[PDB]
């Protein structure tokens, strides 16, 4: 009963660990308990996966007791339950990816509308705050967009976006 | 080139450059008036239809040229042949090898009738000459055409068709002046290890 | 049955584009290496190039800034162009399913394995040629009688492009006995051709050649006499 | 009274061997010639439960074979400091495929003798210049070696059992009316190749496939034939061994000598009994837990260069062979068909064994054109996971913990103590 | 049928040694790997009779521990000529408490090569000047050698039995409720020590007490006990190996280079422990044989230094420490009190072997600040015949004979032979 | 359920012997040392049944020998080049009884180094002038052998009975009515010798006489003995070892120097003790088929030198002594009469081993004054097929295969294995 948020485009790692400081064999499965990584002793196995290209794990911490799982240029579709199988224990951890794309121009003309809409998996309710480049708060839902704006919100725009009492920061530019 | 075979004699058709490397020789046959069909391919592998009556010479030996081998020839086989070679050691041949015309023959002797004419007065009187010389009635379809000015052979503006099935025609376009300035001239045509010479005066 | 059928303008002018479509059926374009090909009149055939839908495709290197082939799924068809085309481009062409093939040896002999290719099925073909002419139309001379008991009379027909020119005797009441000649290509690029009637020498009938051209709309009656 | 797990095995072999090569040299030291029958006797009933995956005595003689290997490193076997840098050059002028080459001959600025002083020497390497070895580099060397697997038979000594279930087709986990109980095993060649068994022992009835657990395809499947299936493999990459002794401290060899200019490194399997194996282990997989499906074979999944390829040795010198000639066949659940198969190799000098103490290197190869013939004996499976809705079943290979390779050998072993 | 004392016994030994030190040659020229098990299976019933000290195997392993000492003597050690005359010195300048010295330096013109030539040569000694070695002297020297136990498993081989008495709390001619049957035991290290067992076994549970006879006093009395106590030796005596090889036949040692100016060589007890075990042993004995008293330890009787002091090895130079610091002790029928021993020591090279058929030396002690942290498992008592009226019980250290330490490891160990 | 006839055996030998000596290599090579124990535990009852000549173990022990022999001619024993010609003289200046020799000094051109060099070397044949060696002759010389049989104790490995007949008297093909069961035998010493057996193991109780068929003359009649026959065979006949080292390939040796012209090779028996076995075995023969006849023993009956003569080792040099004296009664069956006997006897290098392979020569005897004091443990013997009328049953003395050597002291031993 885990969760992790991801951000599209940047690496995650999910992590377990064993109550032996042994290396033993693991396995990672998605939550249709298909492979996407395991070890044969020390050697690494990936599996079948929609990750199998992106998919890694650092060896080092095997021989530790520890075993992680390393996604790198996550998509929004990598969002899943992944488990994994050591010590005849299942840990299950439910990742979340998310990303906000801007609908509107990246030279925005005076007194205009920002537009942005967040991508998410399906079948989630995200919950987003975002901040403008001085001192004012936004609110909203689905597809959040600042109707007015002024010349003085030129600058870095920073925005939350919040799930399961967890939160994580995107930044863009705008001119 | 040409091979001529009576029937149910054997015919051997060569085909392009000597061998250098390994080889995958193809070979096609077209019937007159058709498109190019194919016999072997890989130097010996026959598609379905083809009768083991053809053969071809496999890839082995370096310095020998592709052969196809016909056995039991007959009339239908009256077509001409290609091959397309591949080797290890050239390059991919875009161009096929040189036409071998094979001439079954069933029938022999049949001699030419020839025919031949001075030019129209209607010609002379538009400043302009040909004599026309018409071959016909013979059998096999293979004749040779030359003519002469006097004794001396003409070698410009002769014009000849190919005997088709079978008759044929050439031409010798002159002047008037060049009509007059002879003797006469011939036309002669070879056919089947003899010559036949027509002759036309002034 | 895989069956193939190239189609095609029939006349193009110099320095045109020539493009030909071969409608197929039978087979699925994607599942066959294609082939175009020609054969000029009297000549080899001559392979132009090769195509597959996977981008398996290369040409003749003679032709490779002039000519281009083509896969259409859609319509289930082969298609060619080849720009700048001169009369040296004449040719009846063909379109072929293309089959590939290998030779395969020991590894001791590793560069010596190669690919090959071979035409397994066929098209009819389209001929096409390139020239530069609207029309011409004939001269008819005749060819008088003159010895023999019976004896050849007729008429020389002289000049004319494109092919074909029709000759009747007598507006067709004259057929035993008459040959008309295929046309002689001159080097001039024009064609001429003669006929001939064999009739005896005793002299009671009129005889008149019939000589048409449809391309230049053109029709001639000519007598013949001794 | 029978009691079980103990950390106790006694090491028996020889016949004609003495020290040189490398197995040799481990039978001639842990273990002493073996008494060669054993009586066995199954007596009458005698329990119908055993279990051959929760077996001990395989991490045992796992661990006593790296601890083998270890020792094995300690003296001629040099941990420092040749790998540095790398000026190599291609023998290639003119190319077609983007070839590069696996093999590189180099020239390198080597130490000698004395202070600071050095000479050109030839040397061999994989990738392309400067590069280095990653971390740690551990050349073997060693004047008087080679390595073939010995059998060596494994005992309970002054007082054990080892019990062998004599079941020719047992579960795994399932009932075995005859146990017997044996001094000393047969003798198992320690062999260290992934995906198929080589040299191996042979199932006595018919193609058997063994799980610790069928329904999780993590676990590996292991097969074992009835019937072995041909492979040979051969090298005629040549070099001449050179070994130049300048200074006391440092040894080196010189490679790459000669031409030859062989392809890459090779090998073939004779197909007839591949088709038989395979069309057993097809029909085996559906009256076991596929009854009515196809079942494909695909490929290694990925990973490290030991999983995705047929990872195993012709003589100490690694090799690594294409699997995906042997994983390219559907087998539709109706009648089968002809042709043979060849496979592409690589050779390798470096391995990382143990865990990362270090890379090791079989760095001279000895004379050129070796071929190894083996029997295949089994085959080792990961199941790549399915549906029901596709009306198939996909298998991968498996392997790459060599304990998996021992519990294939160990399938009828395991030691336990006789209270009264 | 059982049937008793026979003489054929077999050795198993090695781990991870070959030559060099005296007992891993005789492991690797008297033994084979042991083979590590024994089901031993105390089956029901089975008598309840056995003596311990009635056991002709102690004689046999004793013998043959000097059979292969007499071996050893045969390849490079040396019987004669150079201990004639010593031209010692003293290393002294200003002295109190007229200590003379113990190990002094000392010259020799010894001979050297051809015929006649002499050299002076460092010598080492243990009493004054002139004084020579008495009778014989065999210096053991020898370029490569140590002297450090290993274990010896013994074994009744292929038909015969060791019968074992597991019994924890045995009376040595009593009953014995738990007999088992085993091939061999479990590995012992000959040490050689007087009064104090070093390394050997320990009790299961409690300290036990055994002797021959009780009422005897000339009997000796062996204590085990359930848990050790440290000791601690260490020489930080220095000296330079020098060996010198000059004519073919000659080759010796010129120990005696660089300094330390150590007092002895010396030892220390942990006192916790000792008095936690001496205390239990005078529990033991009260509710054994001495029901109500007062219970003294004394230091030894009188006698030869192997005698009258703990002698023992520590590398196989032979060791002599004061006794009194272990046996100051009277134990009144109440309670002990805290705190710590050193105790002196001394070495020699010089000891008697055999019975009088000649000395032993070992002559090179090589570097120094030498140490031997070791567990006392053992004592060997006797006890001082005593009267009623003085209310007490006195004991002194004892032994002497090695034998007796063999009792102290065959106490659970009798060879049979088995009929039909 | 016993189950006979398996083709394994162990080895088990050592105590002091090394490398050097031809039958010390093979225990070093074969063996390991040996544990003695057997319980035997002869079961009640078990079977009245057993045929001892049956046994495939005998050929395999033999045949094993014969490949010994043969692996111990692979290094440094020589089949070519130098056997050419002889240039061979006479000692003898004055003759009676026309002598020839048995033994001369000769000379020959032997090459020795570089090419086509040759010096005068000397040489001993046994025969007379040129002659040279018949298809083969391989020179055995090598630095370090020597040739004396050691026991070699077979066993049966690993759980398997040997089944042992301990009976006093068996019949051969007859009832048993103690069989036990045994893991090693006492040692057999390999014995190479013909008509008698020497070294071997001597009757419970009383003299034996097995044969494979009695009623069939053509079987070899064995004949053991509860008393021993004394019998010393010195040769005075004197060489100097000297090998002369001169090329790298080459290696040769020189006989025939010193001086003592002795009697060719003597050998003794004490009729005291051959006097009573064979007078028991005539009683014993009289008592098994020859109830009421006189026995008659005759000299052997012609062929091959080896079938002769009692043909024999005494130390790699192989000996061939008159049967004259041991086969010269008429044993009338009443009385027997005194004295005592000297046999001649001869020696060669040269024996015909294996089949046609090759002759091997033990060409430098070493020393002299070599005396080999045995005895004999057995006889070999064969009836002559003779009439009713002649009241006489004669023997010859026979053997020449030791399969029959090996069933002499095999005959208790058949090895089984065990089913339930």
């Known amino acids: 009963k885990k969760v992790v948020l991801g951000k599209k485009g940047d690496t995650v790692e999910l992590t377990c660990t064993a109550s032996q400081k042994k290396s033993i064999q693991f396995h990672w499965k998605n939550s249709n308990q298909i492979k996407i990584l395991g070890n044969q002793g020390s050697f690494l196995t990936k599996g079948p996966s929609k990750l199998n290209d992106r998919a890694d794990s650092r060896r080092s911490l095997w021989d530790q007791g520890n075993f992680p799982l390393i996604i790198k240029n996550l998509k929004i579709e990598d969002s899943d339950t992944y488990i994994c199988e050591v010590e005849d224990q299942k840990e299950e951890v439910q990742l979340l990816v998310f990303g906000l794309t801007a609908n509107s121009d990246t030279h925005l003309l005076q007194g205009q509308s920002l537009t942005l809409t967040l991508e998410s998996p399906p079948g989630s309710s995200p919950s987003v705050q975002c901040r403008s480049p001085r001192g004012k708060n936004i609110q909203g839902g689905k597809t959040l967009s600042v109707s007015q704006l002024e010349l003085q919100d030129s600058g870095t725009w920073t925005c939350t976006v919040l799930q399961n009492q967890k939160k994580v920061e995107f930044k863009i530019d705008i001119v | 080139t040409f091979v001529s075979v009576a029937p149910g004699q054997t015919a051997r058709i060569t085909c392009g450059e000597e061998?250098?490397?390994?080889?995958?020789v193809i070979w096609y046959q077209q019937r007159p008036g058709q498109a190019p069909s194919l016999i072997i391919y890989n130097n010996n592998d026959r598609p379905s239809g083809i009768p083991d009556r053809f053969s071809g010479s496999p890839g082995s030996t370096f310095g020998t040229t592709a052969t196809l081998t016909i056995t039991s020839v007959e009339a239908g086989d009256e077509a001409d042949y290609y091959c397309?070679?591949?080797?290890?050691?050239?390059?991919?041949?875009?161009?096929f090898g040189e036409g071998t015309t094979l001439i079954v023959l069933s029938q022999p002797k049949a001699a030419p009738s020839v025919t031949l004419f001075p030019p129209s007065s209607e010609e002379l009187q538009a400043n302009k000459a040909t004599l026309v010389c018409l071959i016909s009635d013979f059998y096999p379809g293979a004749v040779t055409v030359a003519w002469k000015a006097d004794s001396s052979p003409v070698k410009a503006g002769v014009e000849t068709t190919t005997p088709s099935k079978y008759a044929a025609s050439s031409y010798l376009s002159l002047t008037p002046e060049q009509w007059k300035s002879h003797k006469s001239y011939s036309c002669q045509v070879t056919h089947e290890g003899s010559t036949v010479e027509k002759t036309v005066a002034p | 049955q895989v069956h193939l059928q190239e189609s095609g303008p029939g006349l193009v002018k110099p320095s045109e584009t020539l493009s030909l479509t071969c409608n197929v059926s039978?087979?699925?374009?994607?599942?066959?290496?294609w082939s175009w090909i020609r054969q000029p009149l009297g000549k080899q055939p001559e392979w132009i190039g090769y195509v597959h839908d996977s981008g398996d495709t290369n040409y003749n290197p003679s032709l490779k800034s002039r000519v281009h082939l083509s896969l259409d799924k859609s319509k289930n068809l082969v298609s060619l162009r080849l720009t700048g085309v001169t009369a040296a481009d004449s040719a009846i062409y063909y379109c072929a399913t293309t089959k590939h093939g290998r030779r395969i040896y020991g590894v001791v002999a590793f560069k010596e394995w190669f690919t090959y290719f071979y035409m397994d099925v066929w098209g009819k073909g389209t001929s096409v040629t390139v020239s530069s002419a609207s029309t011409k139309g004939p001269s008819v001379f005749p060819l008088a009688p003159s010895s023999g008991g019976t004896a050849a009379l007729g008429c020389l027909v002289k000049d004319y492009f494109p092919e074909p020119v029709t000759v009747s005797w007598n507006s067709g009441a004259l057929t035993s006995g008459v040959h008309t000649f295929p046309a002689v290509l001159q080097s001039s690029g024009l064609y001429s051709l003669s006929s001939v009637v064999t009739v005896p020498s005793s002299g009671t009938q009129t005889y008149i050649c019939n000589v048409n051209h449809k391309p230049s709309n053109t029709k001639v009656d000519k007598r013949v006499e001794p | 009274v029978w009691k079980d797990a103990e950390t106790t095995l006694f090491c028996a072999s020889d016949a004609k061997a003495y020290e040189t090569e490398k197995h040799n040299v481990w039978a001639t030291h842990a273990c002493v010639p073996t008494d060669p029958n054993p009586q066995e006797i199954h007596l009458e009933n005698v329990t119908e439960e055993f279990n051959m995956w929760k077996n001990n005595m395989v991490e045992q003689m796992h661990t006593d074979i790296i601890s083998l290997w270890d020792q094995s490193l300690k003296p001629c076997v040099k941990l420092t400091p040749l790998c540095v840098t790398l000026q190599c050059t291609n023998v290639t002028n003119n190319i077609t495929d983007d070839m590069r080459g696996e093999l590189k001959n180099c020239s390198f600025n080597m130490t000698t003798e004395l202070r600071d002083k050095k000479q050109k020497v030839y040397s061999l390497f994989y990738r392309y210049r400067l590069i280095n070895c990653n971390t740690s580099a551990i050349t073997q060397a060693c004047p008087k070696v080679s390595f073939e697997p010995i059998p060596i038979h494994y005992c309970a000594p002054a007082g054990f059992a080892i019990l062998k279930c004599k079941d020719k087709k047992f579960n795994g986990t399932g009932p075995c009316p005859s146990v017997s109980t044996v001094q000393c095993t047969h003798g198992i060649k320690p062999v260290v190749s992934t995906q198929l068994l080589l040299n191996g022992s042979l199932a006595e009835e018919e193609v058997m496939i063994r799980s610790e657990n069928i329904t999780n395809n993590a676990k590996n499947i292991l097969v074992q034939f009835n019937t072995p299936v041909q492979i040979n493999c051969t090298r005629p990459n040549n070099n001449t061994r050179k070994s130049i002794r300048i200074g006391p401290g440092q040894a080196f060899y010189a490679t790459g000598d000669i031409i030859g200019d062989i392809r890459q490194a090779h090998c073939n399997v004779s197909k007839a009994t591949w088709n038989e194996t395979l069309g057993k282990v097809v029909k085996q997989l559906r009256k076991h837990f596929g009854n009515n499906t196809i079942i494909r074979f695909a490929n290694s999944s990925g990973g490290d260069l030991e999983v995705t390829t047929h990872s195993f040795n012709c003589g100490g010198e690694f090799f690594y062979c294409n699997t995906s000639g042997l994983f390219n066949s559907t087998w539709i659940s109706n009648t089968s068909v002809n042709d043979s198969i060849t496979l592409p190799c690589r050779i390798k000098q470096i391995i990382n064994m143990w865990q990362r103490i270090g890379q090791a290197m079989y760095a001279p190869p000895i004379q050129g054109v070796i071929r190894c013939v083996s029997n295949i004996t089994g085959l080792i499976l990961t199941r790549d996971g399915g549906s029901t809705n596709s009306t198939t079943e996909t298998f991968r290979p498996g392997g790459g913990d060599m304990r998996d390779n021992w519990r294939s050998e160990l399938y009828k072993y395991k030691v336990v103590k006789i209270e009264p | 049928v059982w049937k008793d004392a026979e003489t054929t016994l077999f050795c198993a030994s090695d781990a991870k040694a070959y030559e060099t030190e005296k007992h891993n040659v005789w492991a690797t020229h008297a033994c084979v790997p042991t083979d590590p098990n024994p089901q031993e299976i105390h089956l029901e019933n089975v008598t309840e009779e056995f003596n311990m000290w009635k056991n002709n195997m102690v004689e046999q392993m004793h013998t043959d521990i000097i059979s292969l000492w007499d071996q050893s003597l045969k390849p490079c050690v040396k019987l004669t000529p150079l201990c004639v005359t010593l031209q010692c010195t003293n290393v002294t300048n200003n002295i109190t408490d007229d200590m003379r010295g113990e190990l002094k330096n000392c010259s020799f013109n010894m001979t050297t090569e051809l015929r006649d030539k002499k050299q002076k040569v460092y010598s080492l000694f243990y009493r004054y000047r002139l004084i020579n070695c008495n009778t014989s002297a065999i210096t053991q020297a020898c370029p490569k050698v140590s002297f450090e136990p290993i274990p010896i498993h013994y074994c009744a081989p292929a038909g015969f039995a060791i019968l074992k008495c597991k019994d924890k709390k045995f009376n040595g001619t009593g009953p014995c409720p738990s007999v088992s049957t085993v091939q061999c035991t479990h590995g012992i290290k000959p040490v050689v020590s007087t009064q104090l067992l070093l390394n050997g076994s320990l009790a299961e549970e409690e300290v036990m007490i055994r002797s021959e006879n009780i009422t005897n006093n000339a009997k000796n009395i062996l204590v085990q006990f359930n848990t050790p106590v440290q000791i601690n030796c260490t020489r930080p005596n220095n000296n330079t190996r020098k060996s010198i090889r000059i004519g073919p036949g000659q080759a010796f040692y010129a120990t005696g280079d660089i300094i330390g100016d150590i007092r002895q060589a010396h030892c220390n007890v942990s006192k916790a422990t000792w008095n936690e075990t001496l205390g239990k042993v005078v529990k033991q004995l009260r509710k054994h044989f001495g029901n109500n008293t007062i219970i003294r330890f004394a230091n030894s009787s009188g006698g030869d230094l192997e005698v009258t002091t703990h002698s023992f090895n520590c590398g196989g130079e032979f060791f002599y420490c004061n006794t009194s610091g272990l046996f100051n002790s009277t134990w009144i029928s109440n309670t002990s009190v805290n705190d710590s021993i050193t105790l002196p020591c001394r070495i020699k090279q010089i000891i008697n072997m055999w019975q009088r058929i000649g000395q032993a030396m070992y002559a090179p002690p090589i570097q120094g600040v030498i140490r031997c942290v070791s567990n006392i498992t053992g004592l060997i008592l006797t006890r001082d015949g005593g009267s009623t009226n003085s209310t007490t019980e006195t004991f002194r250290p004892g032994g002497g004979d090695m034998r007796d330490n063999w009792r102290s490891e065959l106490y659970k160990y009798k060879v049979v032979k088995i009929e039909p | 359920v016993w189950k006979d006839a398996e083709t394994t055996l162990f080895c088990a030998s050592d105590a002091k012997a090394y490398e050097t000596e031809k039958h010390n290599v093979w225990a070093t090579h074969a063996c390991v040392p040996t544990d003695p124990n057997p319980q035997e535990i002869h079961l009640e009852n078990v079977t009245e049944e057993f045929n001892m000549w049956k046994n495939n173990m005998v050929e395999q022990m033999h045949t094993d020998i014969i490949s010994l022999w043969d692996q111990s001619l692979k290094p440094c024993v020589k089949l070519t080049p130098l056997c050419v010609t002889l240039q061979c003289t006479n000692v003898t200046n004055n003759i009676t009884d026309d002598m020839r020799g048995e033994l001369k000094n000769c000379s020959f051109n032997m090459t020795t180094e570089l090419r086509d060099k040759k010096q005068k070397v000397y040489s001993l044949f046994y025969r007379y002038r040129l002659i040279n060696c018949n298809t083969s002759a391989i020179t055995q010389a090598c630095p370090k052998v020597s040739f004396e049989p050691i026991p070699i104790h077979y066993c049966a490995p690993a759980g398997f009975a040997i089944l042992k007949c301990k009976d006093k008297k068996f019949n051969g093909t007859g009832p048993c009515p103690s069989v036990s069961t045994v893991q090693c035998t006492h040692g057999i010493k390999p014995v190479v010798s013909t008509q008698l057996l020497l070294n071997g193991s001597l009757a419970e109780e009383e003299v034996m006489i097995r044969s494979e068929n009695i009623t069939n003359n053509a079987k070899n009649i064995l004949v053991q003995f509860n008393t021993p026959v004394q019998i010393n065979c010195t040769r005075p006949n004197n060489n100097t070892r000297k090998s002369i080292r001169i090329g790298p390939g080459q290696a040769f040796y020189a006989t025939g120097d010193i001086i003592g012209d002795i009697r060719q090779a003597h050998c003794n028996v004490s009729k005291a003790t051959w006097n009573e076995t064979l007078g028991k075995v005539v009683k014993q023969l009289r008592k098994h088929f020859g109830n009421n006849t006189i026995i008659r023993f005759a000299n052997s009956s012609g062929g091959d030198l080896e079938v002769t003569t009692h043909s024999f080792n005494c130390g790699g040099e192989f000996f061939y002594c008159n049967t004259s004296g041991l086969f010269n009664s008429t044993w009338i069956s009443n009385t027997s009469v005194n004295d005592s006997i000297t046999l001649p006897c001869r020696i060669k290098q040269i024996i015909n081993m294996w089949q046609r392979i090759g002759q091997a020569m033990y060409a430098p005897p070493i020393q002299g004054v070599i005396r080999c004091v045995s005895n004999i443990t057995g006889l070999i013997l064969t009836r002559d097929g003779g009439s009713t009328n002649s009241t006489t049953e004669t023997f010859r003395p026979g053997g020449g295969d030791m399969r029959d050597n090996w069933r002499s002291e095999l005959y208790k031993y058949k090895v089984v294995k065990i089913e339930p």
């Open positions: 397309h070679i591949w080797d290890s050691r050239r390059p991919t041949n875009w161009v």
């Open positions: 039978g087979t699925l374009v994607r599942d066959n290496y």
């Open positions: 061998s250098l490397g390994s080889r995958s």
